[PDB]
Amino acid sequence: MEKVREIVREGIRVGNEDPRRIIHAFKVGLALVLVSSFYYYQPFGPFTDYFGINAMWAVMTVVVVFEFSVGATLGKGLNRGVATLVAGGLGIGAHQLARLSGATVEPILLVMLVFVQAALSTFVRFFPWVKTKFDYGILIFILTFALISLSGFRDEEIMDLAESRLSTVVIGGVSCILISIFVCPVWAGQDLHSLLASNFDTLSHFLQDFGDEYFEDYKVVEKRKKNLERYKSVLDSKSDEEALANYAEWEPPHGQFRFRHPWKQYVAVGALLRQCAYRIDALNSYINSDFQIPVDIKKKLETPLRRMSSESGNSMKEMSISLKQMIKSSSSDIHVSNSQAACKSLSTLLKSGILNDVEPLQMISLMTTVSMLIDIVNLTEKISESVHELASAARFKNKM
Amino acid sequence: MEKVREIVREGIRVGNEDPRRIIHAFKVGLALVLVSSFYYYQPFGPFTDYFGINAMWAVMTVVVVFEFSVGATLGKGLNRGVATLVAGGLGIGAHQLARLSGATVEPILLVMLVFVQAALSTFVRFFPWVKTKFDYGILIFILTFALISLSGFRDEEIMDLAESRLSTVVIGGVSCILISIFVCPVWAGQDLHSLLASNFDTLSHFLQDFGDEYFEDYKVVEKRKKNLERYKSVLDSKSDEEALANYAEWEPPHGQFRFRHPWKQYVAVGALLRQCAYRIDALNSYINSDFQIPVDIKKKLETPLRRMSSESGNSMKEMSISLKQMIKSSSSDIHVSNSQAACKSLSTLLKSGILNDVEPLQMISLMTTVSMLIDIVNLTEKISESVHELASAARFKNKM
C-alpha cells in the first residue's frame, strides 16, 4: 500500500488540479467503443475487408490520433489523413513501375525507391518550419509509403490495400475529431487566454506585496515561496505558450474567438511579460539578500516608490481583468499615467539631493531598486499599449 | 523555381549548419532496406507468417522508432518493446476470460475491459514522472492491448497474433538500435557537453566585449546583433537542455562518459548560467538605452570595472575550455580570486566618495551597472565551484 498510497496521493493531486483530464480520459474510451461498434455492426454497407484488419487499423488510428486539446487532435488527424493519401498515390505508382521493370529486379528497385524517399523525408524533418507544424505528417509519409510498397504482397492486392488503409484512417480520425469537438471540448486558444491572464495576475500580486514588504519562523518560508514561485512560474512558461500557440492555429472559429485571430500577438506579449519577470526576479533577489539596508533610508524614499509600485500593479490587474473576460476597457490609461507622473516626481525628488547622508554601499542597493522599478514602469507602458493594440485588432466587446 | 529557390536556400542552410542530419537521413533508409532484406530472404528460419504482415509491421516499427540521438532511439525502442510484451500478456489473458464468459456476451466484456484499461492508462499519462520518461510506453500499452483484443479475430488466431507482433517489434527495434549505435553515432550526452560549452563561450565573449564597449551606420546594427543574440541564445535554451538530459539518461557508457554519470548536474549548471544571462541581459539593455551617461563619469570608474569584467570573462573561458575537452584544471582559482580582490578594491574606491560631483540620475545608471557586475562576480564564483564539484564527481582527466 505504501507505494500505492504514494501513487494515490499523486493521482488525486493531478485530479483535483484539473477535472478535464478525467473527462478526457473518458472521452478516449467513448471514441474507441464508438469506432469498434461501427465496425462490428455495419450500419449500411459492408466494405471489402479483404485482409481482415479494418478494425485493427481503425482502433490504432483512434488511439494514436486522440490528444488533449481540440487543435491537437485536429492537427494529428489532418496530418495523418493527407499524409496517408499522398503516400498511397506514390506507393501505387512506384509498385506499378516495379512491375514494369522485371521479375527478379522488382525487389531491388522497390528497395531503391523506398531508400530514396525515406532518406529525403527524414532529412526534411530537420527544417524549422516542418518541425513546428508537420513533423507527424512527414512521419506518416515515410510510414505509409514503406508500408504499402515494401510489404510482401502480390501485385494485385495493392489496389485494395491503399483504399483499405486510407478509408480506415479517414473514418477513425473523423470519429476522434467529432467526439472531441462535440462532447465536452477542450480548446487550446481558451487555455492560452487563461494562461496569459494567470501571468498578469501573478505579476500584479507581486507588485502589491512588494509595495508592502520592502519596508518591514517557518512562516517566513511560506511567504518566501509565496513570493518566489508565484513569479517564477512566468519564467518557465515559454515553451507552454509556444505549444498552445501551435495547437491553437488549427482550431475552428468557436464562440468568441473569430476566424482570423492573432495568436502570434499572444506569444509576443508573452515575451514582454517574460522581461518584466526578469526585472521582478532581480527585485526579489534583493528582498532575500544578506547585506540589508537600514530601514530609515528606504523610508526616506518610500512615497514615490509606493505610488509607482502600486499603480503599475493596478495597471497589470486592469489588463488581466479586461482580458480574462474578453471585455474592452480603458482604465489602464489613467492607471499608467499616474505612474508616469510618479516617475517624474521621483526624478524631481532625487534632484533635491536628499541622499547626501548615506554610505555609498547602501547607495548601491537603493539605486539598484530604484532603477529596477523605473524599468518596470516603462515595460508596463509598452505592454499596456501592445495589449491595447491586440484587443483592438481582434474585435473585443466594446460594451464595457 | 521561386518557391523552389526559397526552399533550396533554406535546405542548404539547415544542411551546412550540421551534416550529421544528412548522415542520419541516410541511416534511416539503410535500416529500412536492411529490415526488408531480412524479411525477403529468410536467413535461417521462416516464421509462421500466418497473417502475411510481418514485413508491414517490421517496417512500421523501424520508421516509428528511429530518432536523431542514440538515446532517443534506444528509448523509443525499449519502450515499444516492453510495452508490447506486457500488453500482449494482458490481451491474451483477457480474451481467454471473454471466451470463458459466453457466446453473445463476449464482445460486451471485451468492450468493458478495453474501456477500463484504456481509460486508466490515459489518466496515468498525465503524471509528471511518466510524462518525462515513458509517455510512449503507456501509449503503446493502450495501443497493443486494444489491438490484440478488439480485433475481430477468432479465439484461436490470438495465440499467434501476439507472438507475431511481439517478435516483429523486437527484430525491427534491434535493427534500428544496432544501426544507430554502430554506423556513425549521434550521442546525446556529447551534444549536451558541447551545448554547455557553447553557453560558457558566449558569456565570455560578451564579458570581454563589454569591458571594451561600455567606454566608447548599419555596422552598429551588426554589432547590436553580435551582442544581443549571442547571449539571448542562453535564455531560450532551457527546454533543449532538459530534453537532451532525458535522452542522455538512456545511453550506454561509451568512450569517455562512464556509466554512472551526473546529468542532473548539467541541468543545474544550466540554471545557474541562465541567471548569469539574466544579469547580462540587464547590462545589455542599458548599453542600448536612450538616457546616456557622459563618458567622463564612467571613466572615473573604468579601472576596477575593467578588472572585474575581464577577469570574470577569463574565468568563464577557463571553465569552457576545461569542459569542452573533458580535461581537469585549476586556472579558475586564480582567475576568480583576482576578481574578488578587484571587488574589494572597488568597494574601497567607493569609500573615497569620489562620486560627489555627479547628478543623481547618472548615479542611478552608474550604480545599476556596478550592482549588476558585482552580482555577476558572485554568481561566477558559485558556478566555478559547482562545475569544479561536477568534474571531480565524474572522474575527469587529471593529466592537465
Cell of B275: 541567471
Mutate to test the interface with A, among B39, B122, B280, B354 (most CBs of A within 10 A): B122
Do the Cβ atoms of A143 and B118 come within 8 Å?
no
The residue of chain A with its CA nearest to that of B277 is A278
For residue A289, count CB atoms less than 10 angstroms from its CB and return exposed for 0-12, middle for 13-18, buried for 19 or more: exposed
Would you say A160 and A50 are in contact if contact means Cβ atoms under 8 Å apart?
yes
Separation CA A303–CA A165 (nearest Å): 72
The residue of chain A with its CA nearest to that of B60 is A143
Choose among A105, A95, A87: nearest CA to A150: A95
Cα A140 to Cα A94, A166, B322: the distances in Å are 17, 12, 44
Do the Cβ atoms of B107 and A40 come within 8 Å?
yes
Choose among B89, B75, B88, B67: nearest CA to B20: B67
Would you say A203 and A234 are in contact if contact means Cβ atoms under 8 Å apart?
yes
Sequence letter at residue B203: L
Separation CA A291–CA A172 (nearest Å): 64
Do the Cβ atoms of B127 and A355 come within 8 Å?
no
Cα A350 to Cα A305, B119, B364: the distances in Å are 12, 65, 10
Cα B167 to Cα A354, A389, B65, B164: the distances in Å are 82, 59, 15, 5
Separation CA A190–CA B11 (nearest Å): 35
CA torsion through residues A124, A128, A133, A135, sign: positive
Choose among A397, A207, A239: nearest CA to A314: A207
Do the Cβ atoms of B282 and A281 come within 8 Å?
no
The residue of chain A with its CA nearest to that of B356 is A356
Cα A233 to Cα A198, A201, A227, B208: the distances in Å are 10, 11, 11, 33
Q: How was this structure determined?
A: cryo-EM
The residue of chain A with its CA nearest to that of B13 is A127
For A200-253, the DSSP string reads HHHHHHHHHHHHHHTT--HHHHHHHHHHHHHHHHHHT-SHHHHHHHHHHTT---
C-alpha B383, offset from chain centre: 20
Q: Residues of B with CB below 8 A from A360's CB?
A: 350-351, 353, 355
- Can you tell me whether residue B169 is helix, strand or coil? helix
Would you say A351 and B360 are in contact if contact means Cβ atoms under 8 Å apart?
yes
Resolution rounded to one decimal, in angstroms: 3.2
CA distance A318 to chain B (A): 27
Do the Cβ atoms of A365 and B374 come within 8 Å?
no
The residue of chain A with its CA nearest to that of B363 is A367
Would you say A148 and A91 are in contact if contact means Cβ atoms under 8 Å apart?
yes
Residues 6+ apart with CB under 8 A from A253: A259, A261
Mutate to test the interface with B, among A23, A151, A345 (most CBs of B within 10 A): A151
Query: Which of A21, A143, A238 is nearest residue B63 as measured by Cβ atoms?
Result: A143
Rounded (10°) CA dihedral A371, A375, A377, A381: 160
User: Which residue reads 516464421 in cell numbers?
Assistant: B47
Separation CA B174–CA B166 (nearest Å): 12
The residue of chain B with its CA nearest to that of A109 is B33
Choose among B176, B186, B149, B164: nearest CA to B78: B176
Choose among B325, B368, B73, B265: nearest CA to A286: B368
CA distance A324 to chain B (A): 26
Q: Residues of A with CB below 8 A from B153's CB?
A: 52
- Can you tell me whether residue B151 is helix, strand or coil? coil
Burial profile B271-287: b = 16 or more Cβ within 10 angstroms, e = fewer: eebbbbbbbbbbbbebb
Choose among B149, B162, B137, B143: nearest CA to B83: B137
Query: Which of B10, B29, B56 is nearest residue A127 as measured by Cβ atoms?
Result: B10
End-to-end Cα separation, chain A, in angstroms: 55
Separation CA B29–CA B44 (nearest Å): 24
- Can you tell me whether residue A10 is helix, strand or coil? helix
User: Which residue reads 477513425 in cell numbers?
Assistant: A172
CATH 1.20.58.220 residue ranges of chain B are 188-392
Separation CA A62–CA A170 (nearest Å): 10
Residues 6+ apart with CB under 8 A from B166: B84, B85, B88
CA torsion through residues B214, B216, B218, B222, sign: negative
What is the CATH class of A188-392?
A: mainly alpha
Sequence letter at residue A177: I
The residue of chain A with its CA nearest to that of B124 is A11
Residue A75: how many CA atoms within 13 Å on its side-chain side? 22
Separation CA A266–CA A391 (nearest Å): 10
Query: Which of A63, A128, A153 is nearest residue B143 as measured by Cβ atoms?
Result: A63
Cell of A284: 526579489
CA distance B248 to chain A (A): 20
User: Which residue reads 470519429 in cell numbers?
Assistant: A175
Q: Residues of B with CB below 8 A from A279's CB?
A: 282
- Can you tell me whether residue B237 is helix, strand or coil? coil
Q: Residues of A with CB below 8 A from B164's CB?
A: none
Residues 6+ apart with CB under 8 A from A331: A318, A322
Helix (H) or strand (E) holding B197: helix B188-213
Query: Which of A119, A147, A360 is nearest residue B59 as measured by Cβ atoms?
Result: A147
Mutate to test the interface with A, among B368, B370, B372 (most CBs of A within 10 A): B368
**Number of CB atoms found within 10 A of residue A31's CB:** 25
Separation CA A198–CA A200 (nearest Å): 5
Separation CA B358–CA B370 (nearest Å): 15
Sequence letter at residue B53: I
Residue A272: how many CA atoms within 13 Å on its side-chain side? 22
CA distance A399 to chain B (A): 39
Q: Residues of A with CB below 8 A from B118's CB?
A: 28-29, 32, 63
Do the Cβ atoms of A153 and B29 come within 8 Å?
no
Do the Cβ atoms of A126 and B350 come within 8 Å?
no
